[PDB]
Amino acid sequence: SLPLAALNMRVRRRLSLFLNVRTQVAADWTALAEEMDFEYLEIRQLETQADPTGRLLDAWQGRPGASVGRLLELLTKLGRDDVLLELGPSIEEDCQKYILKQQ
Amino acid sequence: SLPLAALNMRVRRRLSLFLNVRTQVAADWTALAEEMDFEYLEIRQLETQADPTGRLLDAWQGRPGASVGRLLELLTKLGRDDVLLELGPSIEEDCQKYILKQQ
Amino acid sequence: SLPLAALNMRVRRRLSLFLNVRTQVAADWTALAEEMDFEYLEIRQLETQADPTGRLLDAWQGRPGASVGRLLELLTKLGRDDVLLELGPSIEEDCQKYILKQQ
Amino acid sequence: SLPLAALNMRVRRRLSLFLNVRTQVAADWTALAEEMDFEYLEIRQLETQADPTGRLLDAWQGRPGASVGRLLELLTKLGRDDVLLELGPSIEEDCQKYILKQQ
Amino acid sequence: SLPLAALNMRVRRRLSLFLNVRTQVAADWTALAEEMDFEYLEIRQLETQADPTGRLLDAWQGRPGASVGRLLELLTKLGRDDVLLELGPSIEEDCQKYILKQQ
Amino acid sequence: SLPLAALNMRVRRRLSLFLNVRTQVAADWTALAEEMDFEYLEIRQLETQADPTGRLLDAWQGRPGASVGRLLELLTKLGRDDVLLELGPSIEEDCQKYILKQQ
Amino acid sequence: SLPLAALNMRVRRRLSLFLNVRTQVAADWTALAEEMDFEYLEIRQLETQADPTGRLLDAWQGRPGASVGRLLELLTKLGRDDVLLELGPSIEEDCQKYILKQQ
Amino acid sequence: SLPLAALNMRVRRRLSLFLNVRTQVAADWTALAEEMDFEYLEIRQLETQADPTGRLLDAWQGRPGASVGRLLELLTKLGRDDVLLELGPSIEEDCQKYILKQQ
Amino acid sequence: SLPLAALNMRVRRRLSLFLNVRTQVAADWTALAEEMDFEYLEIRQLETQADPTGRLLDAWQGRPGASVGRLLELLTKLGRDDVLLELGPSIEEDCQKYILKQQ
Amino acid sequence: SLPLAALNMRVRRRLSLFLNVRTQVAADWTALAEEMDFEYLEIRQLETQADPTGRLLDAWQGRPGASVGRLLELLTKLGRDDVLLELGPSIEEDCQKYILKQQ
Amino acid sequence: SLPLAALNMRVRRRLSLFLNVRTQVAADWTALAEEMDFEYLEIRQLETQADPTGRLLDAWQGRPGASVGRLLELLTKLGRDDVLLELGPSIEEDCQKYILKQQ
Amino acid sequence: SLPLAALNMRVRRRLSLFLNVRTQVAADWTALAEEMDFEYLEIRQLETQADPTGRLLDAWQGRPGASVGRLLELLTKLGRDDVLLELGPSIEEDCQKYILKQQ
Amino acid sequence: SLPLAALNMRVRRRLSLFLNVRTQVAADWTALAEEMDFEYLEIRQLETQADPTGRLLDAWQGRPGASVGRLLELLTKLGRDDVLLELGPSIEEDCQKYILKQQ
């Protein structure tokens, strides 16, 4: 559907709080980065700078498959329903704000 | 119900004091880790780093069945009523604080 | 009320010292930029150049809702009462100077 | 087809919002600048001044292969379909305005 | 009283030496971060970057209850009188310097 | 053949689960680190940081003999056929993905 | 067949209760350790640390002949049918769980 | 008097050599940990990690009664005059060094 | 031979992906920076800013020994044949493009 | 004595190499910035931009106490005799050049 | 020899591409500006406007030591042989054109 | 004599391999840190970040007694002649390189 | 001669298998630890952690008399010719590998 420029700073910080908690067992932002067809060296470069989830979403702005619904189904494919229950209405509320800005 | 981000540092330390006392006979954090569908190698990786209960709860943040009530009923399924009598009101008090933060 | 041209260089530097301290947790200038209906790409463009709070106030000069009182109530909506206690009398003192310049 | 003077300020700002978000992994304006046969020192000179995408399009005004359709196919060669879905109708609407100005 | 901008780099380093010694038993900076109404994911994000006490004080700059006396009474509520006996006169000496800078 | 940048995060975590189970009798990651011509002090430095198998593979990125097939035959020389039966098809599936990324 | 990572913590504790009862006459874990081609000094090193059956199974993770069926036939070769009658269905139930995790 | 930050690494290792020799009869570091008002689960958590005397002194850094003279009188209350005869002049020599660092 | 202005953005990013993976054991970009006669404080200054390999190549633009072949033989002297097998044809392809631009 | 315009680019880079190595323990440029009566928010603003020592000396150009000898005695008050032994003759050589330019 | 009016726009742009790449480590145009006896405030004024190398050469038009050979030996004194190998024949070709214009 | 900026990355890594092997009995980097008049909380802060020997040498850059010969005699005072026999000629070879850079 | 960093993981495990078999009559690792001038409390601290021979060799890395030949003659002074007949060629083979690494 619509690109990830609809997601403003408040949602993109709340995704960061969940996803850059770096765990060796479960699906942190590196599992998401692998599901978005990033090379290992790209993920390893994103590990260095702070907020790697935000830089991951910035690097996944211009990619041939990127959208908001693709992000919401990749977060379901990872099984992390932690984020879709809290960022459920906020992502829709920032979708409708971007649509109203496009009028 | 609500995710394990409602559980702040004070409760998550008091669960750690009970659960990472590693016993060969009774139900320590490894029995809880088995009840949360972790592989043996995941539990064996969590044994290495300090506070394995806290890293266990961090790795069980994003999992398809995780919640606070699921944790409270898995601690009942293990029979450890040691923790539910002391962390009874504290888990509710940090549930209501997270709800009030969501307003 | 009156536009943000009443705010001269001394107040606009003291807002910059508080607001462009970039934090991942609390409300820096990006939370304020989101509260003023800026797109994510606008905020991301303002991050690049130095003094992003000053360029944020320059980009919020000509906007349909902009005023001094709107700024003072958006800084209350973010909860940052750090700035309203120190820039309390200075914003009024530069309001009254702009009024006296209009005579 | 027709040169890049057909692209007025509104499209050239919306390309700037997408393309000068400088990422180390994906295709920002420097990948586009490399696809338009610029030397490394030219791109390095364009990095210094603000809005490097606008100065990139100004430096690619007079070049032997430059057109609007060449820009639209170089943005497809980079795979960034982020911009062609939002700047789809606007580039055509400013093409038809330039044609009507030529009568 | 007065905000935490009165606390310069020397005091803010000496608080860091005491408070980011991370202990599982006593009150390190995470107990202080919980006493300042931070979510678990905020504290978990502050654990990642170096000097978490300094980033904790930066994130507690703009918060509705923040002051120097609030910090001095939260360090008493944690019972850590280690810091109030050594940073006793230094916090007052940097309070009086900030007051003299305000004249 | 092809370098270890073909091995993305999912395989490199599954090698970590088998290989950093530290045993005194059998061949854990330290036997593999010795087979890759590392000094004792290098292995002793890799023991300190978490995920020593991942940091071992990162330190064996740029080495004169490193490849994917060299890793698969060093894991056979150690006799650990535990990993080649489960990471059999996954290493080939991430080889073919890296080849398709090179086109 | 499938490796010993299928055996989670509950089965690996119930094997430990039977097998590390150290007897001079019958077949405890040292007879099993001899049947798995361990040297005397390896078994003597495993005697020192607590739960020697669990460390024995960890040291027999990566070995050229190790599997679950090999363990079940070595426990038959020792004649200990004490364990195969109680850990009969549990080893199959944790085999099928590992297969379902591999999907 | 003065806090336990006066005690540097050499004294804190020599206390560790005496006190973490774990005896069932006499007063090792657990008797000292009980005399410093630690809960049983705190002491049981300190038993797990290596150098429990050093982690005990780190956890007794910020506590309402902690000082160097309190430590020297709690080691007298336990009757262990083994440590006060060898760490007699060294604790004073590191007290006077901390005082000279405070000037 | 020819200077490092022949190396455009695509090669200079692919060198960055390999070389700024910062390892304590092997030869990352700091070993290369030492082989190019940089002082420790220069390398320590280059560590601070992002993409230190790109800023390293920019600081090694104007140096008395710098060329493309010198870079290719210093990457052989470090033994990193990881980069010469993938950036083999690309460095020649951007050499021949710079020569054709010089005509 | 004479102002800091006597210090040209070569000395001001060599002070930068020593002083902006950011350490948590010793006296980097932030201790010097505190000794020159800068507020915490000023130092925090200078941390953001690259070469903070050079921007620190630029912000300490016009200040009521600034001179070259004041800088040389503040670098002695911090105890950093690292810089006065190497930038000993160079600061005098650029003092005498500024005097000869004033004739 | 002959003044810098012999250097036309094409050479003066190619010197600009090399020299105004602003590096903190090597010799950019500010090292050249220091070698031509400019004050720090002059160089700091030249930093503000775009193409600082061209404005540097314009400000070094009328100076008592300025010539083309002085520029070619100051670029050798800085060790930047990057520019003398590419702007070797072009500076001579624009010297001979200026001589032929003087006839 | 000469400061620790003479010691480049290769020597400073080889000191790190010997000195940050953390032992409870012998003289690791913490004994060296105590011999260089660091407080316990400084050493405890240096323990947290990786390569504590390198950060120890960075924090001992600007200190009133620091030099290369002081380091070589403090490593003799600790009795560690392990490092002076292997880093014997390398420290002199990087001393003479720094002297030749000073010319 | 050469230090104990020449002894890699395979020899250091084979010494551990012989030497940490703890006997009350013969010469285990504690007799060797006494022959290397360790205090009783040091040996008693090394008894606690697993592989006490490896931690004994790590604590005897930096000691004024430590070498490989000193170890081989202290194992002869204890009369244990069990280890010199099996670790005869392996210690020489890892000596020659360390020499070839020093080239």
Residue numbers in the entry:
A (entry chain F), B (entry chain J), C (entry chain C), D (entry chain B), E (entry chain G), F (entry chain I), ...: 19 to 121
Cite, word for word, the article reporting this structure:
The human genome encodes ten TLRs and all, with the exception of TLR3 (Akira et al., 2006), require the cytosolic adaptor human Myeloid differentiation primary response 88 (hMyD88). Receptor ectodomain dimerization facilitates association of its cytosolic TIR domains, providing a scaffold for the recruitment of other TIR-containing adaptor proteins, in particular, hMyD88 and MAL/TIRAP (Akira et al., 2006, Gay et al., 2014). hMyD88 also encodes an N-terminal death domain, which is joined to the TIR by a linker region, the intermediate domain. In vitro, hMyD88 death domains (hMyD88DD) assemble with the homologous domain on the interleukin-1 receptor-associated kinases (IRAKs) to produce an oligomeric structure, the Myddosome, which has an unusual stoichiometry of 6–8 hMyD88 subunits and precisely four each of IRAK4 and IRAK2 (Lin et al., 2010, Motshwene et al., 2009). Here, we show that the death domains of human MyD88 spontaneously and reversibly associate to form helical filaments in vitro.
Iterative helical real-space refinement as implemented in RELION (He and Scheres, 2017, Scheres, 2012) was used to calculate a 3.1-Å cryo-EM map—as judged by the Fourier shell correlation (FSC) = 0.143 criterion —of the hMyD88DD filament with refined helical parameters of 5.98 Å and 98.01°. The hMyD88DD filament can be described as a single-stranded left-handed helix of death domains and is similar to the ternary death-domain complex (Lin et al., 2010). However, unlike the arrangement in the hMyD88-IRAK4-IRAK2 death-domain complex, each hMyD88DD subunit—with the exception of those at the end of the filaments—resides in an equivalent environment. The inter-subunit interfaces are composed of type I(a/b), type II(a/b), and type III(a/b) interactions (Park et al., 2007, Weber and Vincenz, 2001). Type I and type II interactions occur between successive layers while the type III interaction occurs within each layer. Therefore, hMyD88DD filament formation likely proceeds via an initial “seed” consisting of a type I or type II homodimer, which then associates into a tetramer and continues to grow. The RMSD between MyD88DD from the ternary complex and that from filament is 0.76 Å, confirming the similarity in architecture of both structures. Interestingly, although the hMyD88DD construct used has a 30-residue segment belonging to the intermediate domain (ID), which links the death and TIR domains, this region is absent from the reconstructed maps, suggesting that it lacks ordered secondary structure. However, our finding that hMyD88DD spontaneously forms helical filaments whose architecture is identical to that observed in the heterotrimeric hMyD88-IRAK4-IRAK2 death-domain complex (Lin et al., 2010) suggests that the helical arrangement adopted by hMyD88 during signaling is an intrinsic property of its death domain and is therefore independent of its interaction with either receptor or adaptor TIRs.
